[PDB]
Structure formats: structure tokens, C-alpha cells
Design an enzyme around this catalytic site. Structure first.
Site, PDB file in Angstrom:
ATOM      1  N   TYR A 121       0.861  -1.213   0.000  1.00 24.69           N
ATOM      2  CA  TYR A 121       0.000   0.000   0.000  1.00 24.69           C
ATOM      3  C   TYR A 121       0.886   1.249   0.000  1.00 24.69           C
ATOM      4  O   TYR A 121       0.312   2.355  -0.056  1.00 24.69           O
ATOM      5  CB  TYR A 121      -0.970  -0.017   1.187  1.00 24.69           C
ATOM      6  CG  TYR A 121      -0.389  -0.555   2.468  1.00 24.69           C
ATOM      7  CD1 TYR A 121       0.632   0.108   3.130  1.00 24.69           C
ATOM      8  CD2 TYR A 121      -0.858  -1.737   3.012  1.00 24.69           C
ATOM      9  CE1 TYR A 121       1.173  -0.392   4.302  1.00 24.69           C
ATOM     10  CE2 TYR A 121      -0.327  -2.251   4.181  1.00 24.69           C
ATOM     11  CZ  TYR A 121       0.690  -1.577   4.829  1.00 24.69           C
ATOM     12  OH  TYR A 121       1.203  -2.101   5.988  1.00 24.69           O
ATOM     13  N   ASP A 122       2.220   1.105   0.039  1.00 27.86           N
ATOM     14  CA  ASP A 122       3.096   2.260  -0.051  1.00 27.86           C
ATOM     15  C   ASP A 122       3.252   2.690  -1.508  1.00 27.86           C
ATOM     16  O   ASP A 122       2.997   1.925  -2.441  1.00 27.86           O
ATOM     17  CB  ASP A 122       4.456   1.942   0.556  1.00 27.86           C
ATOM     18  CG  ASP A 122       5.175   0.844  -0.188  1.00 27.86           C
ATOM     19  OD1 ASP A 122       4.559   0.236  -1.088  1.00 27.86           O
ATOM     20  OD2 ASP A 122       6.355   0.583   0.124  1.00 27.86           O
ATOM     21  N   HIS A 158      -4.613  -5.034  -2.524  1.00 31.16           N
ATOM     22  CA  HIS A 158      -5.049  -4.862  -1.146  1.00 31.16           C
ATOM     23  C   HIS A 158      -5.321  -3.410  -0.772  1.00 31.16           C
ATOM     24  O   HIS A 158      -5.780  -3.156   0.346  1.00 31.16           O
ATOM     25  CB  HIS A 158      -4.007  -5.450  -0.193  1.00 31.16           C
ATOM     26  CG  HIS A 158      -4.039  -6.943  -0.115  1.00 31.16           C
ATOM     27  ND1 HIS A 158      -5.080  -7.634   0.465  1.00 31.16           N
ATOM     28  CD2 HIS A 158      -3.159  -7.878  -0.541  1.00 31.16           C
ATOM     29  CE1 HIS A 158      -4.841  -8.931   0.390  1.00 31.16           C
ATOM     30  NE2 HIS A 158      -3.681  -9.105  -0.215  1.00 31.16           N
TER      31      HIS A 158
END
Lengths: 657, 670, 115
Positions: A121-122, A158
Site C-alpha cells: 500500500y506504499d 489490497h
């Protein structure tokens, strides 16, 4: 070291690298990036947060060790009992930080992926793509699938934090993992289809992870051996055990272990990431020619598709081998821009010696025979350094070039047995006075070439039928306007019904896109046929002739007489290569006005230089015995070339000079 | 393909099955009331479209056409070579990304390629976010092009630069050449367009060709029309509507040039564009020549006798200067009568040439020097000064040009002889005034001062040295004395032998006392000394005593020739001293009659001393290939020898078909 | 006669000369010796000159790689010639061509056309 890595690669590793590089070349490659790559750059791992939550939930700090379920359970309990804003507070506190990229991201991008799929998610890969200059469409929510700006995706399955640091944008607890298929239908579909229709390489995951195993369960129920096994790049301190290796390979994977490839310390993760990431993959983008049989196999893979054609222009060969060599009009090969194994030199060495050919394995001597026959028919002799007494000859076997009208009438009358005969017959009708019968036959061949083939006769039929349509339309313009006076009568060669139908069918055709619509295999097997749809096929020959003209004329002004070979032998050799190729491949380009202007300017230069050297046998010879002999005289081929491509004014211009 | 847009500026229908929106737009443009009919927003859009079409030069429909004019105009500091204005612009502070785009182009044009690469990278970083797809795309292309040029420059310098420069030059460090190679790994320009958003691929398809390996193949293949021969006998002007191929080709070239320079695209610097420009211009000029010749033949010579089928202007001058080499210009000159082709707009050409002069002065007067900039500034400067022979210049501009040519043009690219050739070409159209004579005098003084050192020695590629500048000065000013060189002589001493020789070569410019003092330092004692003096030292008159040396040598050779008849053997010969004496007598330089007795040894000697009794079966025609203009004129004048030479020349031109013999026949003897 | 070194020979008719890439060793006046020399010819029909100058072309002699200046009468006797290929057929060829052509300095290295 790297030499040692390339050397210790087993057969399997070499084959895997081969396949990865080939798929990268074809434009079908994809990377599945884990969290190890994002921990190479410092970034708070999930376990750290699992600690804080625990410390907040029970007053005590972390104890003992955590199981797999605890990772997904402790955040769940904290969310349930405390609230939503504490979860988000911890998330924001830990994750709102800026971190630098690392070399692995740059290497991954340098591989030129088609898409990218990630479970991080970075935004590290986002910044990587933004610095490398690549453009990707980022998908991290359901609404992004429908409205996508481009055709290539960066897919965060995600989630991410591009809309705030709330816990609803990401998937980080057990409830999110259970209801995944119901909250992310479209993203899951997209990932599955991309996996189905692409080559996938895993990086930074490590076997036994929830995601890798979840997808291995899909591949067992959602497949019938109708898919390509994914690759895996394993980077662990110790080598993989054989039992696990076999168990996972049988379970739809192809492992590549970096620990076996090179040795390193326990905590040198970046070393083993790089030793296998690109230090091996990009460096191995070159060929692997090291044996006396792989040379034959490679050259065969390159030359076999051209057995569909009758002849190939030598200059065009420069494109078949991707500028690895120069092929000259006199038949010599000269190395250029090749840094690997010299396989043309090896091919000619094998040609000379019989024992070296005897060394070839079975089923590989016949491929050599085929290549030898091809290169002998097309006029390729040897490398430039070993040049002998190069000779010049002319032989065009076309029945149409020699003006044998009755034989072509008979040929058209006779029954055909293959589509090659119909291709030739359509060429003939057009060379006889029939644009209506040839158009129909080209469309019929286009119909019947559906069956399995190279796609060569189909593409050439399309080009030729477009050209015949152009020829029909231009006649009508000069038939109902100028033809009314030329003969004094309204000559109606074609009916209004025919001219209407052909126009309706050829209304949407764009010759500019004919090659781009072809299957991608044809585009990577017949890229020399791409120039047969524009003015690019006569560009290299006209730039050469414009230059040799200025050179020969400056010498005739200075009064110089060389005693070597003529400086315009290249003008003659290129002209006859263009004629044989267009007449033996039955192409209607032989009727174009720019080709007639090319042949006229080439033949005029040769005759003018021949007159200059005929009178010099009195100035040099008369002052001293020493002189020359070589010259130029008319023969059957030169007479027919002037008769079909010169106007009476053009012939009179040369007769006065 | 709904319409044809023609270089003329008129538009026509083409395979349009529907409403005539273009015809309606032109009708609305014609009448104001119809425009008043439209709504307000559409009125604003109409104004915008009117500005666009007027700027691009689209006029009206073809049937509604007229005597449309055409004029080229390029708005670019780079096309006009405003190097100082460009640098000032670079130094300012930007306000937009378009300013950065233009500034990175200006950086590329001044040879600062690392700054260009870095600025393009910064623009790429900002533009993807700023949603400027056009600038993003064009910056990608331009950065790849700059990378290619850097890469080829490094190879060229490391392969041959160290030799011609005399020292290995390092324009780019190793860190930069490693970093860029790391950044541009496996980068492919071929998939750049296809990877862009589809709205971009729909709106800006016309830019796709900017990512191909080669463009301008249809333009080159369309040049075959200028080579037609039937047209002169019978031409329809089928090209466009009553337009010959010449106009279409020229306007196509202007469109290409303006599009590439005004949009700041770095493809203007590559080999393909230069070749295309060369081919186009050469073929155009040749066609004009052919038309003039055929017209003179068909109609009277009075009809188009010196008519110029080609009229040159400012843009043609700059194009040839920037894109031709010296060999290419030498071909266009021996091919056609460029001296018959007239140049226009000479004030702007003078401005351009003075700009070249001042940039040369700045480049080489100052210690600092840019390498890639010099190599891309030395070819155009040389071409411009070579092609400055056909234009008329003012005195001050001529002086600036001459000073830059003589003092600041590096010796590595223009040596003494090529300097002289360049300079002497400029006096053909502008008679030498006093100012340039003074400049040449200063140049001669400086070169004389260079010779105090022993090791110094002039080096030329065609045998022309300071002697020729000296002769050129005196050609236009018969009475000229250099006072500085005179006082140089008067301070001269014996041990300054090199200066003795140097100033001997320049004797006519010295004063009376100067030359007396100088000739006091040399004397003639034998025939070898006499010939050395005549060649170098300028012995003008054959003193009575000098002729006696000649006769003594001739009698000695007579005795040796009798002994040779006894021998019947002659090993070899190198240079004939007898033939020179024969010519000198025939030119009326030796006035003695004794040498007439010494006759019958060498054929050429007899031919030149006693033409009437000469056995003309021994004449060798190739003799005539060594004589110069004055000697050929003299030979034509004399009566005993004119008709025999006519016969031999006529027999040679008939058989051999040689052009030097033909020109000798037709320039002097008939 | 036949050799691979005769593919570089060119004949210039305006001045009746041979251009060839060869190097010569020359004994001058039977007393001076020089090695590795050659000549360069310039064709120039309009040069500002006087009555002493009546030739169209000028010759420059180079010894070693350095310009040579000789004031003594230049008697010339070839003794050895060498090509880049280094063949010795050039040594015999040079004498034959020199005997055939009457112009001075039959074979030179370069010709410069100044008009």
C-alpha cells in the site's frame, strides 16, 4: 562473481532466464511484488504494528511469539473493542512517513513490465515509475477499473493510502480478508485475467505466504492445464530443501533460488536480491550461442519464414538480423554492431569444411542444407575479408518480364491446383488487360487463405488488390474525361455497378494500418514486408543514386580516369535486385511511376559514364601504352529496361549528349 | 481525408460524403452578418479558429482562389543565430514549463548538453503531474535524441578527436556518462506513443511520426519530378493547379523547416535532415539551369540569354551555409553558373555575416572555448564565408569580416593558403579599398615578426604563402610602400637569415633604402644562383653579366653534348634549364644572339627560338598543357606557329575528346 | 604487370600526371641522399606573377614528413619506391611510367585544383 553465477546456472535456470527475457521482448511480462522489496527500503513492517496494538489492548508488551492467525486477529480485536479512530490513529502514526526507493525498484522498471501487480500500500513503486518516466494507470479501488486513462495498470490488490489513512481503503484484518471476494469483485477479476494472459514473476514474497497459497488453490480448481506456470524468485538465507522444491513445483510454480546461485551472509538481503534480480536477467538479454548446433538453430529460426517468398533483397537482410551485420550487393558479409558470438563467421567456416559439418548432430544437417540452398540462391557468398573474384550475373525468371503474352493466356486458361497458382494468375490477368478479373481473383484468394498458413499470401493479396483498385479508378478519370477525345468515343471498360461495389468495399481500407492489424507473430517474422505499403521501399536506393551521381560527374569534370573497378557497379547491382524481387514475388509496384523514374535515372548515369570511358582510350593510352579495358555494352536485359521505362524524349536527350 | 490542404494555402474537397463544413466556415468568414447570426460562445470559438487559421496560413477555397502570395518567415532565435540573446534568455528565471522547454532547446543549441539533459528530466518530472501530455511526450523524444547525440560524440572524440585536436578532450566526465547509461537502459522509443493515454492518442496522432527511426522518405522520393526531361519539350504543370514542381518542392521544404524549428525539436541537427536539404537545393538549382539552357536554344540567345531560373534570398543563403559542406558547394558551382544567379536581400545577409564574424571573435579571442559548440559552429562559419563571394558588402562590414578571417579563424581549420583563397574570393565583387589593404599589411607585419624564432615555419596545403598576400596588395595599388616593414628591414642584420629570406619574398613593398640595404645581403655568382634568385629573390632584369653566364653554360653544354654524341648514352634528366632560356628569349627577356648558334640540342629550345625553321613533326602536344595564360596568348600571336598549333590541337580534340585541349583551342587560338 | 597495388593509381588529364600513394628514396646530383620523399602538385592557371613565371602548376617536395627546400639544381635519380602494400612491382612500374610520360614529376601524391 557474475561470470561464476552465469556459469553455475543449471539447465533449468538457463531455460527460465531464456523464457523470461523472450517474454519481456514480446511485451508480455508482469511482476508480482511483495513486502520484502519494500522493506529493503526501511518501511514499518506489519508485525511492528501488531506489537503496538497488543501493548494498547493488554497493558503488557509483546510476549513469546505470534502465530499466523494472531497477526490478523489482534487488530480485529482492537477494532472491535476500542473503536475505529484508534485503529486509524495508529495507522496514521506508523505509516505517514517518507522513505527512499532502492535499486531493486529501478531494476524491476528497467525490465519493461507490461503491467505491475503488488500487495503493498506504499507509493514507492509510484515514485519509481514517476522518476523512470514510465506511465502507468494506478488501480487501488473499485471505481478505478471503469475509468482508466491508459491500457497498462499498476494494480494494488489490497489497497493504498491515496484517499486518507482510514482502515477502509486497505485490507489489514480478518474481516477484510474474509469478505474480499464480495467487496472487490472487479479488481479480483482483473488480476485473474491478467494472470491468465501474461507471464508472471514473483519477487519478494517467500513461499508459505497467505497470498501465494490462496492463488495456488484457485489454479487447481479454476484450470484444466490451460495456463502457463508462474515463476518465483526465492531469496532466503539458506538453500531450499529438495522436498519442498518438488512439492511446490508440482503445485504450479517454477522456483529460482538466489541462495544457491551465490553465497552471502545471513543479513545481506540486498546482495541476494540484486544477484538474481537484474544482475542476471538484463545482462542475459543477449543470445546464448556457444555450440556448433545452436548457431544453425538460431539462423534457421530467423530464416525459415522467408521460404514463403521467392527472393529477398540483400539490403533488406540488414533488418532480419537486427543490424548485427552488413550484407553487401556484391555478396559479402561484414560484421557491424555485434558483440557476441560470431555466428555468420561460424556458418561460413562450416560451409567451407566438410568435417565441421560432419560434427553436426542428426536433424541439424538438413537445416544446414536448407540454409545453404537459400544463401546460394540469393547470392550470399562469404565474409568480406575472405573475398574471392566476385562475379556479376542477371537472371529474372518472370514470364511477365519477358513479355510472353500467349503463354500467360494459356496459363490463365488452365486449371489451378494451389493458391500460389492463383496468386500468379492474378498477377498475369493484370499484366494482360483485365483489372476486373484480377480484382475478383485477389478477393477470392483473400477469402480462401483462411486456412492455416504463414499469412504471407493474404497480406500480399490485400496490398495488390488495393493497388489494382487505385489503377481502375485513375483510368475512369481519364476515360470519361480524356478517353472521350483520345479515341473519340465514350469507352466504358467497367460497368457502373462494378465501380460502385469496388468503391463501397474499398471505402474503409487504410493501407497504413494493414500491418499493425496482423497477428504479432507475423509482425516479428515478416517486418521487411512492412515497407511494401509506402515510399519507404525505394528510400535507401534513391539516396545512394543521388550521391553516386554527384561523385561520377565531379570526376568527369576534373578529367580523372581510374584503373580499378567502376564506381557505378553498385547502381547496376541494386537496380537488378529491385527488379527480380518485384517480378518474382508478383507485385503490382512494377507499374508505379516513381519506380519508372528510378530505373530511368539509374540507366542514364551508366550510359553517360560508358561514353566518357570510351574516348579515354586515346588520352592516356595515346600518351603511354598503360590503360584500361573494363566497360559497359547493351544486352537483352538493358534493351528491355530502356524500352519499358523511357519516353521518346528521354531517349532523344541521351542521343544528343 | 475529408479535404486536401495545398501548400498554396487553398483547400479542396476530397472523398467527403456529407455537409460542407469547411465551405460554410469560409462563407461565414467572408460575410460579417452570417457571423453575427452565430451565438456568443460560438462567436468566441470562431474568433479563436480565425486566429489559428490565419497564423497557419489557410486562405480560402480553391475555386475562390486568386493571385495568392507566399513568403517564408520563421520566428526562432535559433534559426537566425542570435547566440547572445539566447544566452540572455537562458540566464533569466522561468515562469512556465513552456519556457523550460524552449530554454532546454536553446541549451542544446549552444553545446551545453548535460544542462539540456537535466532540464528535460526535470520537465518530465513536473509535466506528467501538470497534465501537459504534449510537453511530456515531446520532452521524452528530445531527451532520447540528446542522449543519442552525446553517445556518438563520445565515440567520435575518443576515436579520432585526440589526433586532429592534438590533445585528448573530455567534454563529459565519467560519472555523467555512467549515470545516463544506467538511466537509459533498454529504453525503447518505439512503444512511447502506444503507452500514452488514449485521449492523447486520439487528439495528437499527427505527432506519431516524431518517434520513428526515419522520416522524410516520401519527400525525398518526390524529388524525382525535378529530373524529368519531357517537361521542357511539353509540360502541363500538373503539380497542384498550374504550379510547377519547383514551387511545390520549395514550399514543402519551408513547411518542414518552420515546423521543426518553431516547435523546438532537436531532430533539426541530425544527418537525415541535412542530407534532405542538400538534395532538394541541388536539384532545384540544376533544374533552373536546364530550363535556361533549353530556352536559349529554342528561342534566340537574346531570349533568357543570362536569365536566372533561380532567385536566391536570405533564407536560401542561411540554408546553404548551415547544411552544405565545401565539397557540396564546389559541385553546385561547377555544375551550374552560380555567377549567373543573382542574390537578393543583401542587407540581411550582411547582418548575418557580421554576426558570424563577431561570434568567431568571441569564441577564439577569449581563453574559454566550448568543444561541441565549436565543432557545430566551425562548419557553418566556413561555409558562410566561402559563399560570401556572391554578395555585395559595405566597407565597415567588409573590414570586420576580413579582420575576423585573418586574425581569429583558427589555424587548425584554415591555414595560410586557405585563408588566402577565402580572402581573395571576397575581392571579386568588392574592389579592395584602403582599409582592407591596411588590415592585410598588419597581418603581414605580424607574420614577419613571427619569424624571429628559428623553429617557426609556415605550413600550407596548396603552396600559397605570404608572398601571395603581398602580390595581391600590389595588384590593386601599384605604388605601395610598407613603412613598418621598411623599418623592419632597416634594423635588419646578417645573422637574421630567416628574416632575410622572408623579406626577400616581399621586396616590392619595401622602400628604396630598405631594398638597397636588403640586396646588399645577397649576390649572384653562378647560373644556379641566378635561377634561385629569379625563383626566390625576384631578379627582374638579366644584367649584361647575367646573360654571359647563360652563354658560358650553354657552350659548356654544347661541348658536353658533342661528347654525348660520342657516348650515345644518357642516364636520366630531372629539369630542363635550356627550355626556360628558350622561353625567356621568345618572351623577349634575353636580348643576346649568340645562343642562336647553340641550336639543335633540345626540341623545345629550338621550337621557342627559331619557330619558322622548326620541324613541326617533332612537336609534342602535351607541351601545351604546361603553359599559362600569358604564354599561350603570345604563342597565338606569333605567325610562324599559329596554324601548326591549330592543326595539332584540332587533331587531338577530334581523336581524344579531351576538354583541356578543347578549352585551349577555343579560348586563345580561335 | 598485374598486381593488387595498381588499384589505387589514378590518371589526371588536365595536367597529364599520375596520382599514387607511394614513397621514394632519392639520390640528388649523385652527392646528396634523401629517404621517404614525395611530391604535391598544384594546378593554378590564374596566379598573379611576372615574366619569369610561365607555368600553370607548382610542385612541392617533401622529405621524411617535413617540407624540403632545395636551391641546388634538382637533378633527380630514383633508386627505390614503396607502396603501403610494400610490394616491389612499384619500383619497376615507376620507371616505366616515368619513361612513357614526358612531363616532369610524372607520379605525385596529391593534386590540388585551384581553379
Amino acid at each position: 562473481k557474475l561470470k561464476e553465477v552465469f556459469l553455475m546456472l543449471d539447465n533449468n535456470v538457463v531455460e527460465c532466464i531464456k523464457e523470461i527475457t523472450e517474454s519481456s521482448r514480446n511485451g508480455k511480462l508482469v511482476f508480482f511484488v511483495g513486502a520484502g522489496v519494500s522493506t529493503l527500503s526501511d518501511y514499518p513492517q506489519w508485525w511492528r504494528l501488531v506489537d503496538k496494538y497488543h501493548e494498547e489492548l493488554y497493558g503488557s508488551p509483546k510476549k513469546g511469539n505470534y502465530s499466523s492467525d494472531e497477526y490478523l486477529r489482534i487488530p480485529q480485536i482492537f477494532y472491535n473493542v476500542k473503536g475505529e479512530m484508534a485503529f486509524d490513529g495508529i495507522l496514521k502514526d506508523f505509516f505517514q512517513v517518507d522513505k527512499p526507493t532502492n535499486p531493486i525498484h529501478d531494476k524491476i522498471l528497467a525490465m519493461n513490465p507490461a503491467h505491475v501487480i503488488t500487495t503493498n500500500y506504499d507509493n514507492l513503486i509510484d515514485t519509481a515509475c514517476w522518476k523512470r518516466g514510465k506511465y502507468f494507470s494506478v488501480i487501488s479501488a473499485e471505481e478505478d477499473v471503469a475509468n482508466a486513462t491508459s491500457s497498462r495498470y499498476l494494480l494494488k490488490v489490497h489497497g493504498d493510502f491515496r484517499k486518507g489513512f482510514k482502515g477502509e481503503n486497505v485490507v489489514l484484518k480478518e474481516d477484510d480478508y474474509l469478505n474480499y471476494d464480495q467487496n472487490y469483485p472487479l479488481i479480483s477479476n482483473l488480476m485473474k485475467t491478467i494472470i491468465a494472459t501474461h507471464t508472471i514473476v514473483f519477487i519478494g514474497y517467500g513461499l508459505g505466504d497467505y497470498n501465494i497459497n490462496m492463488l495456488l488453490n484457485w489454479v487447481r480448481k479454476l484450470q484444466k492445464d490451460s495456463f502457463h506456470k508462474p515463476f518465483f524468485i526465492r531469496t532466503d538465507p539458506s538453500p531450499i530443501e529438495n522436498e519442498t522444491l518438488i512439492y511446490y513445483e508440482n503445485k504450479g510454480l517454477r522456483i529460482i533460488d538466489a541462495a544457491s546461485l551465490i553465497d552471502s551472509n545471513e543479513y545481506d538481503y540486498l546482495e541476494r536480491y540484486s544477484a538474481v534480480m537484474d544482475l542476471l536477467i538484463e545482462s542475459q538479454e543477449n543470445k546464448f550461442i556457444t555450440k556448433d548446433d545452436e548457431v544453425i538453430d538460431y539462423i534457421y529460426g530467423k530464416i525459415s519464414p522467408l521460404f514463403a517468398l521467392q527472393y529477398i533483397r540483400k539490403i533488406d537482410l540488414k533488418h532480419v538480423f537486427e543490424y548485427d551485420y552488413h550484407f553487401e550487393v556484391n555478396g559479402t558479409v561484414v560484421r557491424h554492431k555485434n558483440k557476441g558470438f560470431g555466428y555468420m563467421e561460424r556458418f561460413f567456416e562450416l560451409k567451407e569444411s566438410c568435417d565441421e559439418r560432419s560434427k553436426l548432430s542428426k536433424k541439424q544437417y538438413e537445416r544446414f542444407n536448407a540454409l545453404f540452398n537459400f544463401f546460394e540462391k540469393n547470392g550470399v557468398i562469404c565474409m568480406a575479408k575472405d573475398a574471392g573474384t566476385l562475379n556479376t550475373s542477371i537472371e529474372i525468371n518472370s514470364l511477365a518480364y519477358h513479355g510472353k503474352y500467349d503463354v500467360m493466356k494459356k496459363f490463365i486458361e488452365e486449371q489451378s491446383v494451389s493458391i500460389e497458382d492463383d496468386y500468379k494468375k492474378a498477377f498475369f490477368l493484370a499484366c494482360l488487360g483485365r483489372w476486373e478479373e484480377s480484382y475478383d481473383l485477389y478477393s477470392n484468394i483473400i477469402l480462401n487463405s483462411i486456412d492455416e498458413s504463414n499469412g504471407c499470401v493474404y497480406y500480399l493479396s490485400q496490398i495488390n488488390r488495393y493497388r489494382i483498385y487505385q489503377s481502375i479508378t485513375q483510368a475512369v478519370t481519364q476515360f470519361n474525361g480524356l478517353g472521350l477525345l483520345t479515341f473519340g468515343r465514350h469507352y466504358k471498360p467497367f460497368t457502373d455497378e462494378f465501380l460502385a461495389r469496388i468503391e463501397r468495399e474499398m471505402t474503409n481500407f487504410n493501407i497504413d494500418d494493414l500491418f499493425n492489424g496482423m497477428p504479432f507473430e507475423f509482425q516479428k517474422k515478416y517486418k521487411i514486408l512492412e515497407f511494401l505499403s509506402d515510399n519507404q521501399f525505394l528510400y535507401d536506393d534513391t539516396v545512394k543514386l543521388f550521391e553516386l551521381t554527384n561523385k561520377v560527374r565531379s570526376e568527369m569534370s576534373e578529367g580523372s580516369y581510374s584503373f580499378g573497378m567502376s564506381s557505378d557497379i553498385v547502381v547496376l547491382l541494386r537496380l537488378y535486385d529491385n527488379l527480380r524481387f518485384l517480378y518474382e514475388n508478383c507485385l503490382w509496384s512494377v507499374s508505379f511511376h516513381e519506380f519508372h523514374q528510378y530505373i530511368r535515372n539509374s540507366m542514364s548515369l551508366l550510359i553517360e559514364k560508358a561514353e566518357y570511358e570510351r574516348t579515354r582510350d586515346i588520352d592516356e593510352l595515346g600518351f603511354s601504352f598503360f590503360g584500361k579495358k573494363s566497360g559497359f555494352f547493351m544486352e537483352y536485359y538493358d534493351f528491355v529496361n530502356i524500352s519499358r521505362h523511357f519516353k521518346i524524349d528521354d531517349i532523344k536527350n541521351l542521343e544528343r549528349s | 481525408y475529408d479535404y486536401h490542404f495545398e501548400v498554396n494555402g487553398t483547400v479542396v474537397r476530397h472523398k467527403n460524403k456529407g455537409f460542407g463544413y469547411m465551405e460554410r466556415f469560409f462563407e461565414l468568414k467572408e460575410s460579417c452578418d452570417e457571423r453575427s447570426k452565430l451565438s456568443k460562445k460560438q462567436y468566441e470559438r470562431f474568433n479563436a479558429l480565425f486566429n489559428f487559421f490565419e497564423k497557419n496560413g489557410v486562405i480560402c477555397m480553391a475555386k475562390d482562389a486568386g493571385t495568392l502570395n507566399t513568403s517564408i518567415e520563421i520566428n526562432s532565435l535559433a534559426y537566425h543565430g542570435k547566440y547572445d540573446v539566447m544566452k540572455k534568455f537562458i540566464e533569466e528565471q522561468s515562469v512556465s514549463i513552456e519556457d523550460d522547454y524552449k530554454k532546454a532547446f536553446f541549451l542544446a543549441c549552444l553545446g551545453r548538453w548535460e544542462e539540456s539533459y537535466d532540464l528535460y528530466s526535470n520537465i518530465i518530472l513536473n509535466s506528467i503531474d501538470e497534465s501537459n501530455g504534449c510537453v511530456y511526450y515531446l520532452s521524452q523524444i528530445n531527451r532520447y535524441r540528446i542522449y543519442q547525440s552525446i553517445t556518438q560524440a563520445v565515440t567520435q572524440f575518443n576515436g579520432l578527436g585526440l589526433l586532429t585536436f592534438g590533445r585528448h578532450y573530455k567534454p563529459f566526465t565519467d560519472e555523467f556518462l555512467a549515470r545516463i547509461e544506467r538511466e537509459m537502459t533498454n529504453f525503447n522509443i518505439d512503444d512511447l506513443f502506444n503507452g500514452m493515454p488514449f485521449e492523447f492518442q486520439k487528439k495528437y496522432k499527427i505527432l506519431e511520426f516524431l518517434s520513428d527511426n526515419q522520416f522524410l522518405y516520401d519527400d525525398t522520393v518526390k524529388l524525382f519530378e525535378l529530373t524529368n526531361k519531357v517537361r521542357s519539350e511539353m509540360s502541363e504543370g500538373s503539380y497542384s493547379f498550374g504550379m510547377s514542381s519547383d514551387i511545390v518542392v520549395l514550399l514543402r521544404l519551408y513547411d518542414n523547416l518552420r515546423f521543426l524549428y518553431e516547435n523546438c525539436l532537436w531532430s533539426v541537427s541530425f544527418h537525415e535532415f541535412h542530407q534532405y536539404i542538400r538534395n532538394s537545393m541541388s536539384l532545384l538549382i540544376e533544374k533552373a539551369e536546364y530550363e535556361r539552357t533549353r530556352d536559349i536554344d529554342e528561342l534566340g540567345f537574346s531570349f533568357f540569354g543570362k536569365k536566372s531560373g533561380f532567385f536566391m534570398e536570405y533564407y536560401d543563403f542561411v540554408n546553404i551555409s548551415r547544411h552544405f559542406k565545401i565539397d557540396d558547394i564546389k559541385n553546385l558551382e561547377r555544375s551550374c553558373s552560380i555567377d549567373k544567379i543573382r542574390f537578393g536581400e543583401q542587407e540581411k545577409i550582411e547582418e548575418y555575416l557580421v554576426g558570424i564574424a563577431e561570434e568567431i571573435t568571441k569564441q577564439f579571442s577569449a581563453n574559454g572555448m566550448n568543444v561541441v559548440f565549436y565543432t557545430q559552429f566551425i562548419s557553418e562559419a566556413k561555409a558562410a564565408l566561402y559563399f560570401a563571394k556572391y554578395v555585395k558588402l559595405s566597407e565597415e562590414g567588409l573590414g570586420k569580416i576580413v579582420k575576423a578571417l585573418l586574425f581569429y579563424f583558427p589555424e587548425r581549420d584554415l591555414d595560410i593558403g586557405k585563408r588566402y583563397v577565402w580572402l581573395e574570393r571576397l575581392t571579386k565583387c568588392n574592389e579592395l579599398p584602403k582599409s582592407i589593404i591596411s588590415i592585410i599589411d598588419d597581418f603581414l607585419v605580424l607574420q614577419a615578426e613571427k619569424h624571429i624564432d628559428q623553429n617557426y615555419s609556415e605550413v600550407s596545403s596548396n603552396g600559397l604563402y605570404s608572398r601571395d598576400y603581398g602580390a595581391l596588395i600590389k595588384h590593386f595599388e601599384k605604388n605601395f610602400i610598407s613603412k613598418r616593414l621598411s623599418e623592419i628591414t632597416l634594423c635588419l642584420t646578417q645573422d637574421k637569415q630567416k628574416q632575410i629570406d622572408f623579406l626577400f619574398k616581399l621586396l616590392p613593398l619595401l622602400s628604396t633604402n630598405a631594398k638597397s640595404h636588403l640586396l646588399s645581403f645577397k649576390s649572384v655568382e653562378n647560373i644556379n644562383d641566378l635561377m634561385n634568385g629569379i625563383r626566390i629573390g625576384l631578379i627582374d632584369e638579366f644584367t649584361p653579366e647575367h646573360e654571359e653566364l647563360i652563354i658560358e653554360y650553354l657552350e659548356t653544354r654544347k661541348v658536353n653534348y658533342i661528347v654525348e654524341k660520342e657516348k650515345g648514352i644518357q642516364t636520366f634528366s630531372s629539369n630542363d634549364y635550356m627550355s626556360t632560356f628558350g622561353i625567356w628569349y621568345f618572351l623577349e627577356e634575353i636580348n643576346n644572339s649568340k645562343m642562336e648558334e647553340f641550336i639543335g640540342m633540345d626540341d623545345q629550345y629550338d621550337f621557342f627560338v627559331d619557330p619558322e625553321n622548326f620541324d613541326y613533326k617533332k612537336f609534342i602536344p602535351s607541351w601545351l598543357k604546361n603553359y599559362n595564360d600569358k604564354l599561350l596568348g603570345k604563342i597565338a600571336g606569333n605567325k610562324h606557329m599559329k596554324h601548326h598549333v591549330i592543326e595539332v590541337l584540332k587533331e587531338r580534340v577530334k581523336n581524344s575528346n579531351d576538354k583541356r585541349y578543347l578549352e585551349i583551342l577555343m579560348n586563345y587560338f580561335i | 604487370k598485374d598486381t593488387g597495388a595498381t588499384h589505387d593509381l589514378v590518371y589526371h588529364s588536365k595536367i597529364n600526371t599520375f596520382v599514387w600513394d607511394v614513397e621514394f628514396d632519392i639520390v640528388l646530383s649523385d652527392s646528396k641522399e634523401l629517404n621517404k620523399c614525395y611530391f604535391v602538385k598544384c594546378f593554378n592557371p590564374y596566379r598573379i606573377n611576372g615574366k619569369c613565371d610561365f607555368a600553370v602548376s607548382s610542385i612541392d617536395i617533401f622529405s621524411e614528413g617535413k617540407r624540403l627546400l632545395i636551391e641546388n639544381e634538382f637533378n633527380f635519380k630514383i633508386t627505390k619506391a614503396v607502396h603501403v602494400a610494400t610490394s616491389k612491382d612499384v619500383t619497376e612500374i615507376v620507371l616505366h611510367l616515368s619513361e612513357r610520360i614526358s612531363s616532369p614529376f610524372p607520379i605525385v601524391k596529391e593534386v590540388v585544383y585551384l581553379d
